[model samples]
Every structure is written in structure tokens, then in C-alpha cells.
Target: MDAFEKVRTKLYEIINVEVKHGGFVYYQEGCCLVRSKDEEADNDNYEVLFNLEELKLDQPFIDCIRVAPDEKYVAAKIRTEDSEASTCVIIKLSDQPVMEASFPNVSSFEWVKDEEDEDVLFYTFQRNLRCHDVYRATFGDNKRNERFYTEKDPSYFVFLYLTKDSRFLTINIMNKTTSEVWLIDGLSPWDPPVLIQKRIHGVLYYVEHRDDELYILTNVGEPTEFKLMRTAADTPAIMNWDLFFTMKRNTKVIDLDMFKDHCVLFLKHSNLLYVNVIGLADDSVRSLKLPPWACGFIMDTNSDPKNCPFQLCSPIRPPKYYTYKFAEGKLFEETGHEDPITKTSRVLRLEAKSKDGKLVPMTVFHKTDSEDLQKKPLLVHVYGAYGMDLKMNFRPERRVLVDDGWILAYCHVRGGGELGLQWHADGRLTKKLNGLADLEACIKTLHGQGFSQPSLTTLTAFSAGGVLAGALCNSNPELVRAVTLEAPFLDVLNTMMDTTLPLTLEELEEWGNPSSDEKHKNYIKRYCPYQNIKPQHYPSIHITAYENDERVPLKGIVSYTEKLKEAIAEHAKDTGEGYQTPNIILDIQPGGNHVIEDSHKKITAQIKFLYEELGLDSTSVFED
Candidate 1:
């Protein structure tokens, strides 16, 4: 086969990948691709609200579209070809675009009917990206567009959203370890947002409105685990809270979705995620089982009291949607995408002993026919930051890699919510190095099990995971031959040292403020990839960066590449014919965001690169 024909064997179709959001479904529209709440809506029923020419956006992509509760106005966060920053454009649908209410740096927005039964819009905008100011206005009212709340603290981010029942507009002001909730009665949109709980130093609490009470999941005192509580909606102060339920099971409550008759607790136990359904009447909890190798997620449970949309997806399996019915006490299949199940794989639940006595969980995937004793290339994926669990979500490339005799594994390390808050606490700030230790331990165990040799392994990471991957590659250059990082945040100490940089002051809790004092500066410098890396025969590294990624700027990647090159140039290979050559790359795409995802073209490119680096013949692995 020729080069192009060889590539065709690796390529497959993922067309029409329809996206279904709360009360809406979408396709290419082939623009403005939108469908209403009707589940059985015709393919042609999807109507284009507007096109790119109308918004003057060069790319066909629209960041996000939120239909008003009344469905009369649609608010989409959009950007133009000329700018990298996104702004809110509230288009009134008098059959649409009747008028446009635009705002700068909007984070979130919600629509509610006021006491007079008129649609009112509320949005939160970030002034300096740290300073969040909230504004409410009637679409047609020219002078009545009023500002209500403005949070000036750099340590916290203010977010605005509507409650489950859409009866309250919630304002959440929070940092990594702390949270404070404020609410405005939907019936009284003009009234000031009232406080539910004051911002405590290390407390993280969130609210969900039910019938007449506010359901709360708080780590105020539990620290590692959340204690569910409730308070009367009218009296939402912290002091007014009553213990809702006590669970003997060791679980971490991440989110609580309260419906009229039932509630769903999004939870994690022992690095495994699952949901518990609660009957509002008896308060009895029923655990929902997720399929093996599947990661379940809770989308917005808006407007539906009887059911909440739940999805179970995997690295190889297509996402299947279901709605949990409160009365029936079960989940019914709603809709899903079509996939030709030609690839077969196996998943194994494994564990590794970390530096501490704790046994870390790891998920391994491989082809069914692959010999367990045989050595194959091992691709290890890891992320250990922000208390965010590294999900085994659907990635198109994972199946292809595994099918080609590659062992893919996920190392559930510390510093993430895989275990719980303590998981996050142990891996962050003073304990950040603890996370890196866990990753090394997991990788070593995989190696010991004959999954791959030191020269046949690759470390894959995204965002904060880059911290662990970079440090691991630098710390143990013999462990892996290649590494792929997607928009990774590697220059940790430098970014944190700059208070003028975006997310620098805000993420102080996660990555310590190096400028705070000599103690912190020295501690953070210990793990900062950019600061810690030295002259060595480093692994072949491929880093994909974005031009408009606000979280991890492009400048840091440039700095990391230059520093790595400088280190490589300084080191000499004693016995080798020439200095050990290590491939290094930093590809910056034009337009993208914070989300760690790859485009179709990027996926194909990554697959081809992996094949070349692993010394594997691409077409030989394919079976017809």
C-alpha cells in the first residue's frame, strides 16, 4: 500500500456526530444546528437560528447556545474572526435576531420570568477575568439594563446560573477550596441576590433548590467527604441548615441534583464514579450501576422533575443516553449515536502501591486477543489537579491504539478528585509532589506486569496532567520513549510567580503562590516542570498547544521548548556516534479553548505520529 492508502486503513468515519444538550439536539445544520425539546423531532425539523455571516464569525463553530426558558431569546457565547476573546450576544427571536443585547466577557447567563410575567435576563461578566460583575436586563428595555453584583476578589471566580426548578438565580463565588452561594428569587429578579453561606477559608459547598428547601452538599467540616444538608429556601443561612441524610458508605459527593420528587447525588468511591438516586419521600438511596469501562456523567437536569439526563460513555464505546425516572425508579434509554462495533477490547481493574501504603486504582484496556504475557507499547494517561477526576471518556483514537496491540491505561493518581477532597488536598499545594509520586508508582507497576518496556512506553497528559507527565519524563528519562501533552501547563512556577498573569492569583490554592515567600517559592520550584527540567537525553516529546487557550498560554510552551533544547544541547553523549537525538515539537493551532479535545485531523495526525514513534507498521495491524 502507498502512504495515502496506508493512512486510509487507519482512518474511519465519525460523521454526523450529533450533539444533544438539555432540551435541544444539534447537527452541522450544516450552521446554527438546533432542535427543540421534542425527542422525536424530524431531521429537517432542526432550524438554523442564524448563520456565521449574521454573527460575522469566520469559523462555523459557535461556542455555546442557551435558549431562554421561554424559548423567545437565545444567548450564544460567540467570537469573531478578528478577535480571540468571546462575548455574549443575546439574540431575540421575534422569529429571531429581533434585537441583539451584547455584553463583554460573560461567564454564564440565565433567563427567568419576573413577577410581572415578563422574560428577564441575567448574566455574569468578568471584567479583568478575575473581577466578575452581574447584570440583568429586559431585552427590549434600553435604559433598564442594570448591574446588580460585582465581585472584585482575585482569589474567587463568580458564576451565575439558574437553579433546578428555575425558581432561583444562583450566584456562586468560589475558589478551589472555598465556595459561597448567593440566590435571587426568580419571582423577584429585581431583588438583590441573597447569601446562602459566607465564604469560609477552606469550606466548599454548593446548593440545589427543591420544593421549598435548598439542598446542600458541603465539606465545611467533613473536609474529605460532603455531608448533605438542607435549609428552608426563605432562610438559606448556614446556621439554618439541618442534616438531611447521613451515609455510612465511604463516598464523595460532587454534585447534588434535586428534582421535584427525586434527587441524584453525583458521587465517587474508590476512584470509581457512580450516581445514587434518592426518593424525595423516603429519602432512600439507590445506587446506579455503570457498565464496566464506562464513565457516567450528569448533564443539566433542568425543567424535568421526573427525570435527569444521564450518559454512560467510554474510551471506545459511543455515548449512550438515558433518563432516570423518579417514579419508576429506573433509567430508560432515550437516544444515542450509531456505531459499527467492529473493534473488540477488554478492560481490567488493576491497582498499584504508591509511595504511601495506599493502593492506587488503575484501568487498563487492551485487545481481546493480545497476550497478557507479551510486551506491547503502553500508553499511560494521567491528570492530577483541580480536584477534577480524569474521566475515561470516549476518545476515537483509544480504540484504534488498543486494537493495534497497544495497552492503554489510566493512572488514577492523587491531587484529583478520583478518590475525593482528601485526594485533591493531598496532591495540591504542600502535597503536590505526592501526586507525582503516585503517577510514578502506577507506571512502574504497569511496567512490572510486562505491559511494556522502558523504551516502549509513552506518557499522555492534558492541562494540569502535564505537570506530572513532564516531571515524570524528566525525573526518569529511561521510563518512557515518547510523551504527548495536549495544551499542557508545564511552566508552573513562572506562571504562578507572575501575579499579573490570568489564573495566576485565582489558582493559588492548586499551584502554590511562589512569590508568597521563600518557603513556597522553593517548594513550588521542586515540581515546576520548566524549573526542574535539566540537561539530559529526554524523551521524544510532542506538545499540542492552542493560540487562544487562556488557561495555559502559548508563551509557556515556547519557553519550555527552548529550555528543553538548551538542556539537550548542553548534554553530550559519551559513547554515541553523536549527541542523543530526541524529537521535540510544539504545534500551535489557530483557534481552540480550554477543553482538552482533538479535532479529526489532529487525531489522524496523532495516530500517524504514534505509529512512527513506536516503530510499528500501521497497515500491518489492520484486519479486513
Candidate 2:
């Protein structure tokens, strides 16, 4: 096949897989079911076992999922459009809805089964002091249920856990500077929830229990570090909370699981996703090596324990499910399934010096070989907000870009925990402009060094990075050849003011509410991308957003696009430029969500736009 055919063929291949497997692997067991049969038969290629109908029937919006201890049923929660209410659905492996519960605004739910006869599921859903909705539920049938109100004050609950004996499950509630701990007995849902402990300095942000010991994580007092404790003691005593390695308060714990006497803590710090393994016995911690260039990781224990201990990881490079075995206290990679088109991208650590004389960290992946690095176009990607780090991992799908001769560079910019929490906090609020400066520095460094030659370079960042990208374009438009933004938070002030928007209240911990007259008047005038459009020095821009984004309102993006177009039009008229200084385009994905659904469309649109902007015509123009 020719280049066009090759690209089109790959796109079709992806669509086929998507159609059969359904969106997001977690949504359906299609991939798992197929592999399960293959394993059972020793080795046999068979038809896909997961039905597409089942995928849609379960509803896939639940942020988290769990299986009943009995393995007879699985419990999944579905969030409503308004997010004020969420319904829990218990599906039979061979039947339907054995038991179900609908909370007005259930944030989380879990099934805890200790004994065979006494099968019970415990979960804490929506609750407020006035509303008294937050509590644990024990259900036998749909209508037969009981509830227990949490004795703790009105506070936001972060994590929940069940003790090894299965008698009590602890819930961690955090508010402002206080953290209240509550324990619920599985046998009695009507019994009042008891407040076991409360802390004023640091709040329990994460709770996990083993045997009779409880591991509680706190970070309210020490913004740069977290404390680890065992709450089972009469007074929860701090065991370990190393200030050095525990730094990076802005880090968000993504996943927590305990096995093999080891507690695994998966986190998103700035740009890199981190896996920290804590030895429960001594509280010693170790960092697990990721595959390289990985942004997301999820664990799956459905495999035979004797065969493999691996979790599926999906990185920016591509979506992949592999079995990683921990042998000799180290991880060994093994392919779970073979994909004909999967390709491994290359990683190179690029060290650049910042104005402050600090070594800035970055990683670059090439679509082409080292020989082609000089010949192919480059895309610099960044999302440094909240101490996140973009680490290395294997993603075969991302090979599509490399297959087409393009380079992808990830900048571990400031305001992320790649280096530490201080690095992340330095880029928010008053110091928030650090994101803008760091990105500009990366652009200047890349372009000036010929790594990203002018007119051959592109910049991509979503949400917060979108804000960074917008600001970067206004600051250093001459360097980037094209810019692609996905559901970007361009109008920060406006987005922060819209209380109805999702995650806005939670986000105030990072980006302070710009609603206060003084704060709003200042920030709106300062950091708001829609308001901060400088005199034109534009690049080719492609802005993509969904009409129904709940996190970052669609209206914000619309306002940004309209204002940008007006500015560009007026600037072009004044300067008498041929078409306009910046070749700007706005693309709308009608039903796209905040995260943007349909990976095939997201990738192809960006690839097509970049190719066209870079003066490479892989095919005829895509007609409206």
C-alpha cells in the first residue's frame, strides 16, 4: 500500500478494533474475554467473546469499578449528566441487576464480602451534614436495604478501605485543614457510624487497611510532603512520612492496591505517572520503573497468579495491555497479545538549562530513526500543571506519528512533580506564570537549537496546557508552525467563575477561585487567555473542543475562539498581511466530552491538521 493507503488502512484498523472492543478498555471485557478463552485453550484464535450490547448495557461513565468478593456479580456506578446523582448497578456474570442502589450524588462505592453466607456490599455515596446522605449501605435485594449516616462532620471523603477481618471498613474524610476518620461495620448498616479519629494538622486523604492495621496518608499540614500512619492504634500513630521522597504535595494519587505484602501507590505528579511501592512492614518505599514515556497505568488481576502479575498500561505512545511480572524484586516485561501494527517509539532525555540555572528535564520520542530526526517535523507537547511528569512507556498506537515521520517531544515543565512538589506549586496561582515561562523557554530552546526548526514545529497541550499553549502562542508565535489544543481551558477566569461546571470547586485548591472581587478583578485581567491576546505574532492554530464539556465549559472555548478570530481579523486588516499573520482554524467535535471521546478521530484530526500546516499533503482536503 502507498503512504495514503497505509495511513488510511491503519485508521480503519483502529476503527474496527474500537467498534468491536468498544471505547476505553475498562468499559468492556471484549479484549479480556477474548484473551481469557485463548489462555484457556492453551492457544487458539477465536471470535471476540465480549458482546458490544453488554458494553452499552452497563454504562461506562463510572470513574471506578470493582468486583463482588463472591465473584458472582460486579458493581459499577454510573454518574448522571448533572453529577449531582449517581446510580449503582450490580450485574450478574450470567444474569442482571441482582441488587442496585441510587444515591442522589454518590461519589464512590465498594463491595466488601468477608464470609460466604454473609455477603454484603458497603459503599459511601453522596452525603452532607444537612442532607445526611453519606453513609454505608448493606443490600440483599433492590428494595431490601439499610443505611448508616457518617458521624463525622460535613467533609469531603477521599478514600475508603476494608479491614482484613472484614468486620469494619474505614472512610477518610478531609475538609480544609481537618481530617475525620469513620469506620462502618458490615453486619449493621442501621448502626450509627463512629468517628475513630480526627486530625487537625494533616487530613486523611487516602485510607488502606491490612489485617487490623490501617494505613492513612496525610498532607494537609506539610504541603511539600505526606505522612503515613496506622490508624488501628488507639491514637493513629505516624509510622513514616519521609519529607524528602514524600515531597510533591500537589501529586494526585491515581490508584491504590495492596498485594504480596506490598502497598502500591500509583500517582500523577505534574507530567509523569509514578508507581510508588511501600513495604507495609517497614514503611520503606521504592519507585517501580515504568515502560518509558507512560502517562496512564491501570492494574488488572484477572490473570492466573501462577502465570503472571501484570497490569495494563496505556501511554501517549499508544494503548497497550501487557503482563508485567515482578520477579527478583524487579519488573519484567512480557507481551500479552500481539498487534501487527504496534511499534515501539524511541526515547531520548534532553537536558536544558533554565534562566534560574536549574536543569530542566524533558524527553523526546522520534517517529523516525536517528537518521531521520533532522528530516521530520517535531511536535512539542506539555501538561506541567499540578506536579505531573510525563514518563517513558511503550505505546504502539503513538507509532502512527513516527510511522509518518514526525517527532514527539514531551517537556517536564515547571509546576509538576517530576522534580518534586515545589516544582509544581511554583507554577500555580501567583507563580502560575511559571508554566508560561517554562513553555516559552522550551520553545525557544527547541527552535534555537534546530531540534524544532521554525515552520516545522508544532505545540500541543490540553486543558491547563491549552491555557499554556494559548499564552505561548501570543508570546512566541514565530517559533511554532502549528498548534493543536483539545478542550483547552483558555478562559481561566470565566471557567473558574462558573460554579455549575464540574471540578471547579475542587480545582480552587490549585487555581484559587477568581470569583472574589479583588481576586477576580486581578486574575481576570492578568492570566485569562481570552483577555490576554497580545498584538499578533501568530502561528497556524487548530483548536478542538466538544459542545458538551462539563469540566471546562464549552462556552469558554467558544468565547475564546470568537475573540481570537476577531483579534486575528482586526490585526490582519491593520497590518495588511496577505491572509493573516496566523493561519487559524477552529474545529468542533459535536458530542466530544471534556476528555474527548473517539481516539481515532482525535489522532487523525491532529495528524491531518499538522500535515497540512507543515506543507505535507498526504491526501486531498477533508471536505465539510
RMSD of 1: 7.2
Q: RMSD to native for every prediction?
A: 7.2, 8.3
> What does candidate 2's lDDT look like per residue over 404-523, in tens digits?
667777787786667665676677766666776677777677666666686788878777778678777766677787888877888777666655635554577677766765764575
lDDT tens digits by residue: candidate 1, 302-326:
4366666667677766677766666
Query: Cα lDDT of model 1 overall?
Result: 0.70
Q: Against the unseen true structure, what C-alpha lDDT does each candidate score?
A: 0.70, 0.57
Cα displacement (Å) at residue 509, model 1: 3.9
The candidate that achieves the highest TM-score relative to the unseen native structure:
1
